[PDB]
Design a protein around this ligand. Structure first.
Ligand SMILES: [Co+2]
Length: 9
């Protein structure tokens, strides 16, 4: 989850 969001941002 942490990276799914980080990349999206
Ligand atoms: Co990242």
């Amino acid at each position: 989850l942490a990276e799914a969001l980080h990349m999206a941002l």
